[PDB]
């Protein structure tokens, strides 16, 4: 093996922030390395709606601002990550859990073209709302295994995924 030092790590590095802006992998969303091409919006009265899955995880809280529980409704590759990003929110601080302020969208809030019209985006925040976390949230989404990953704004963590 590799040797002694490269076993279960006792003292591991904490894992750096992302600062204001910065995008990872650091290149565009749409790439194929980062979250590839847009494949159009879903509506309601579509199809591609009904491969769409709800996320009904009692450690996530949420927002629902549009009380249709439509943020709620993801492809499986986005339950997937943000379910991963749930237990490690809780684990790095106690008492607070993972927050989406905003998933699927049906109302055109995000440009002409966006992964959020497709249950492939999500906003995130701490539920303590302490926007002095987001940094290390948006970290903790890297490490969860989000396709790509924007500290988009003071406010909010935009992460999203690569289709299916
Ligand atoms: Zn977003």
Known sequence: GPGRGFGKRRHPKKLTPLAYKQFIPNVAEKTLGASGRYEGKISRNSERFKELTPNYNPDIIFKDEENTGADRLMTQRCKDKLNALAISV???????????????????????????????????????????????????????????????????????????
């Open 90 to 164: 809780m684990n790095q601080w106690p008492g607070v859990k993972l927050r989406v302020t905003e998933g699927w969208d049906e109302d055109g809030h995000h440009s002409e073209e966006s992964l959020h019209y497709e249950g492939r985006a999500v906003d995130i925040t701490t539920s303590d709302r302490d926007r002095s976390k987001y940094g290390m949230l948006a970290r903790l989404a890297v490490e969860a295994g989000f396709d790509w990953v924007y500290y988009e704004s003071k406010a909010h963590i935009h992460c999203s995924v690569k289709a299916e």
